[PDB]
Structure 1
C-alpha cells in the first residue's frame, strides 16, 4: 500500500544521453541507433535568442559544427556525418550506432497523461521525476539552465516510449518541450518572445483515480450516497475549470474493486472543490490531478 509519485527506471535512457556542442552552446542529446536528437536552439549564439532565423542558422552549419560526446560509461567522441532540422529539433547522424539502443517507440502524449523525466546537465543524468501534461500542454517540472535536451519517456513491456525533449521555461515552474517529430507541446515557438499560455484545468479523470487510491488506502470520509451524472458533472466542469469526464476501463476496474461508483466520485469532486473544510485526503488539503488511472492501478495491484 501507499501512493507516491513513481517514475520509470531510467537506466535504459541514461545509456542514450550524450552531450552536443555547437560553438559555445552545449546541451543534451538522445543517441538511438546512428541518430542524435537535440534542440535546434543549440545553433543560436547566446545573444540572438529573441527571434532566431533557424533556416539561415542551419545553412551556415556543416557536419563539423557539431561535437557529440558520450560522458557517462565508456566515454567517446561520436563523429557527426550528417545533419537535418525536424521541427524544433536537430537530427544529427553519427558514424557509430548506439550499442545500448533499447527497443523503443516515439509517441506524443495527450493532456492528462503522465511521463517520467530524466533531467540532464552536460550530457550527465542528474535526476528523475514524473510530470503530467497539463490541460494547456505545459508541464510543471524542475529545470535549470543547461537542462535542454532532457528526456521524457514511459516504459511498458520492455519498450521505452520517448515522448518529450526539454526546450524551455515559460514562466515560474512551467515548462515545455517537443515530441520526437519536432512538434512543440502547446505549439509554443522556440524563441524568447512572450507567448501566452492557455488557462489550465484540473484533470477530472486523474482526480477520480486519486480518490479511488485514497479509498484503497483507507481514506473514505468523502464518499457519500450522493451521485452526480456524467453529463451533469460535465456541464458543471465547463464552468469550473475541470476537464470533461470520459469513462475508461481503468476507472471501471477501480470502481468495481472499491464498490464506489464514478458518479459518487464526481459528487465528491464538486463537494471537495468548494473546500476540504479542515480535513485531508492522503495528507493533502487540495485535489491531486497528476496520477492517472493506470498510475493508480500500478500501485494498488499488478
Structure 2
C-alpha cells in the first residue's frame, strides 16, 4: 500500500566507501578487496581541468601521493594505475567488508540507487534513472565525486555508476566502473552540455502497470493502438519512441495484469492528450518516469536482500 521511490539498502555499499586525497583535492573512493577505484581527476587542479594530460600528471605522482582513509584507518597505497577515466589504487589491506559484487554498464532509462558521500563518509541515499540524454538528475555538492550508483539482486551488488562531474544545467555525468563515461562527456573543463532529453516511455508504462496492480485503474479503456500510431502521439509530447524490444520487456507485467502493452499505450495516449483531470495515479498528479519494469516487480512483490 502506498507508492514510494525506494532505494536499495545501502549497507553493503556504505562498507566500501573511503576518502581519497591527492595534494589539496579530496574525494571519494570505492574499496573492493585490495583495490580502491576513484575518479582519475583526483590528481587535478584548476587549469589542469582546463585540458589535462592524465598520462603525464599521473607520472609525477607516486604511491605516497594518494592518501586513502577508511574511517580512521589509513590504507597504505602500494600500487597505482589508470583505467580509462578511473584511478586504481592497490592497497595493502583487502576490504573485510567486500560484498559479492560485479561491474555492469547500465542502459539509458534504467535506474539505480546512489549513495552520496563526502570525505569518504556516506551522507544520503536516493534513487535516480539514467536519462535518455545520458545524464542523471542527482543531488551532488562539492566533494561528491567518487560516489557510486548500484543495483542489488540476491546477495550481489552490481555497481553501475561513479560520479565525476556537474554539467552547466546542474545535472550530472559519470562513468561505469571500468572508467568509460556515460554519454559524450569527458573529464575536462570544456563547453560540453546536456543534450535535450525525453520522458522514459518504457518506465511510464511500467508505472502505469504498477498503478493497475495496486487497484488504481481509472485510466484504462476498451481500445488499442498500433506501435506506429502510439509513437506519433507520444513523440509530440517528447516521449522516447517505444520499440518492439520495450514491448517485449513489459511482457511479464502485461501477462500479470492481462493488459496487452498496446492496450496500455492507448490508455497512455489518452492520458497525454486529455491529461488526468485533477485525478491522480498512485498518488501523483504527474506521470512518473523513473520507475522501471524491474523496480515495479521489486517494490510490488516484496523482494529482500539478503
TM-score of the aligned structures, taking structure 1 as reference length: 0.93
The aligned counterpart of 2:21 is 21
Residues 1:260 and 2:259 are matched in the alignment:
yes
Alignment counterpart, residue 139 of structure 1, candidates 136, 149, 154: 136
Closer/same/farther in 2, CA of residues 172 and 283 from structure 1, 3 Å limit: farther
Cα deviation for residue 235 of structure 1 reads 4.5
The whole-number CA distance in structure 2 between the counterparts of 1:85 and 1:176 is 19
The whole-number CA distance in structure 2 between the counterparts of 1:265 and 1:165 is 35
Alignment counterpart, residue 95 of structure 2, candidates 91, 94, 98: 98
Give 3-state SS (helix, strand or coil) of 2:19's partner.
strand
Alignment counterpart, residue 166 of structure 1, candidates 163, 175, 180: 163
Cα deviation for residue 37 of structure 1 reads 0.6
8 Å contact 1:3–1:213 — kept in the other structure? no
Residues 1:195 and 2:192 are matched in the alignment:
yes
Residues 1:61 and 2:61 are matched in the alignment:
yes
The whole-number CA distance in structure 1 between the counterparts of 2:98 and 2:301 is 31
Return 5+ residue gaps in structure 2 as ranges.
none
The whole-number CA distance in structure 2 between the counterparts of 1:70 and 1:270 is 51
Alignment counterpart, residue 206 of structure 2, candidates 187, 205, 209: 209
Give 3-state SS (helix, strand or coil) of 1:206's partner.
helix
The aligned counterpart of 1:270 is 269
- Post-superposition Cα deviations, 1:3-32, rounded to whole Å, max 9, x if no partner, equal 211111111111111100000000000011
1:1-302 equivalence runs, <5 A: 1-46=1-46, 48-71=48-71, 75-238=72-235, 240-245=237-242, 246-247=245-246, 251-274=250-273, 275-302=275-302
Range 33-42 or range 247-256, more displaced = 247-256
The whole-number CA distance in structure 2 between the counterparts of 1:247 and 1:231 is 14
8 Å contact 2:67–2:74 — kept in the other structure? yes
The whole-number CA distance in structure 1 between the counterparts of 2:31 and 2:301 is 35
- Post-superposition Cα deviations, 1:121-158, rounded to whole Å, max 9, x if no partner, equal 01000101111101011011111101000011111120
Cα deviation for residue 239 of structure 1 reads 5.0
The whole-number CA distance in structure 2 between the counterparts of 1:207 and 1:104 is 29
The whole-number CA distance in structure 2 between the counterparts of 1:5 and 1:159 is 21
The whole-number CA distance in structure 2 between the counterparts of 1:207 and 1:273 is 11
Cα deviation for residue 263 of structure 1 reads 1.4
8 Å contact 1:63–1:83 — kept in the other structure? yes
Closer/same/farther in 2, CA of residues 255 and 199 from structure 1, 3 Å limit: same
Range 19-28 or range 252-261, more displaced = 252-261
The whole-number CA distance in structure 2 between the counterparts of 1:92 and 1:257 is 47
The whole-number CA distance in structure 2 between the counterparts of 1:276 and 1:248 is 24
Return 5+ residue gaps in structure 1 as ranges.
none
8 Å contact 2:3–2:283 — kept in the other structure? no
8 Å contact 2:110–2:130 — kept in the other structure? yes
8 Å contact 1:25–1:46 — kept in the other structure? no
